[PDB]
Amino acid sequence: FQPTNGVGYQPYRVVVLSFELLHAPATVCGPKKSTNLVKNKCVNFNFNG
Amino acid sequence: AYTNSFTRGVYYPDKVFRSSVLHS
Amino acid sequence: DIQMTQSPSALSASVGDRVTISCRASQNIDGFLAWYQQKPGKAPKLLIYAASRLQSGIPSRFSGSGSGTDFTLTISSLQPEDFAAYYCQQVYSAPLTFGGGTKVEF
Amino acid sequence: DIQMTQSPSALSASVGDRVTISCRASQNIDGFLAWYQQKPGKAPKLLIYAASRLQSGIPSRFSGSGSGTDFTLTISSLQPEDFAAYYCQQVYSAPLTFGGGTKV
Amino acid sequence: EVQLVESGGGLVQPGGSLRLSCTASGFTFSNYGFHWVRQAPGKGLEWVTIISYDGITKHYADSVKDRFTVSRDNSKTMVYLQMNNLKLDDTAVYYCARDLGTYDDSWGQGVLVTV
User: Which parts of the sequence are annotated with region: Disordered (chain A)?
Assistant: First the structure.
C-alpha cells in the first residue's frame, strides 16, 4: 500500500456486521420511544422488534 | 464395547417454544 | 518535491489561551501530513497523524484539521509544557520535507 | 515535468552475466515507460514498450518489470551485441524525458 | 514501549567521513522501515534519507544525494547513516525516526553533529 498507488490499489477499511434474526432474547436492540405495557384490550405491540 | 443409543441423541431443534404440536 | 512552510509567525499567548497554527503544502499531498512538537533539546513528538485522528499519548486539547493542501492544528488550552516549535511534514512523496516551524512562547 | 534518472550511471559486466538497469520517475507515471538500446553511432532500438511488454523483434532475455515510479530492466544472459547505451523514457505526460544513460 | 537512541555524532573536519548509529529496542527492528532526519540550528527540520525494512530499497534527500549513504543490519538492530563530503551547512542534530508520518512513528533523542 503506497500514497502513489492509485485509488484502485488504495487500502480500504472494511467492517462486516453479521446479524442473526432469532426468536432468542436478542439483547442488542437499539431501542427508542419505549412505552408501558397494556393488557386486556386490542393493541399494536412491538416486542423486541 | 458397544451400546445401543436407545432413544437418546436428540437436542432441541430451534429456540422457538412449541406446545401440543408435532414438529419435524 | 513538495515544500512545507508554516504561515503564522511566533505567537506569545499566555497559559490557558487557545492558539491555532496553519501549515500549507506547495502541491496537493492529500491527507498525508504529520504535526510534530519539538521542545528545545528534546525529541520531536508527533501530535496528530494524517488528519483528524489524534496520536496515542497526546493530550486531547491538540486537534488535527485541514484537507488537501491546507492543514491546521488547534490547541484548546495552553500550558507550560505546550510551548515549543511545531513542525509539519508531507508523507505523500517518497522524499520527505519538513515545515519551517512556528515558535510558541508564554 | 517528469524527471527520469537511471540508477546505474555505467555498469558493464562479462558475457553471460545477469544484468540490472534500474530506472525511476519523479512522479507516478503508471506503466507508461519505454526502454531503448542506442549503440554508439546507430539508431535507438525499442526493447520494451509500456514497461511490462516486450517489443517485437527483441530477444527474450530482456525483461521489463515494475510499475508506478520504480522500474527495473533485467537481462538474463549478457551477450556481445547487448552492450549499448540504455535510456528509459516516460510517455505518460505530453513532455517526454529520456533517461540519462547506462553504459553496458 | 518503543525506544530509539542515536550515537556516533561529533565534531568533524569539513570533507570528513562521519557515521551515525540508530539504536533500536523494544520492537521488531526488521519488520519496520527506518528514516533519518537532521535538525540544523535555528532552522526547520530536514529529512535526510530512508531505508526499507529489509534494506533493499533506499532513497536520499536532494541536498545529501550521492554524499550520504544509509545502511542497516537486521541482526544488530541498527541503522547507519554514513556521511561523506561534509560541509558547514550539513551541521545539524541528527534524529533517527522509525515509520515517519504514521501512528507507528517514534523519535530518537538524537546526537549532535558539528562540522
Answer: 23-45
Residue D28: list chain A partners with CB under 8 A: 4, 6
What was the structure determination method?
Answer: cryo-EM
Q: CA C103 to CA A15: how far, in whole Å?
A: 42
**SS3 labels along chain D:** CCCECCCCCECCCCCCCCEEEEEEECCCCCCCEEEEEECCCCCCCEEEECCCEECCCCCCCEEEECCCCEEEEEECCCCCCCCCEEEEEECCCCCCCECCCEEC
User: CA A19 to CA E66: how far, in whole Å?
Assistant: 59
Residues on chain D touching A4 (C-beta within 8 angstroms) = 28, 68-69
CA distance C18 to D68: 43
C and B: touch, per 3+ CB pairs < 8 A? no
- Resolution as reported, in Å: 2.6
The whole-angstrom separation of Cα D78 and Cα D76 is 7
- Look at phi and psi of residue C47 and say left if phi exceeds 0, alpha if psi is from -120 to 50, else beta: alpha
Q: Provide, as residue numbers in chain A, all residues whose Cβ is less than 8 Å from the Cβ of B14.
A: 23
Is A5's CB within 8 Å of D68's CB? yes
CA distance A20 to chain B (A): 13
CA distance A2 to chain C (A): 8
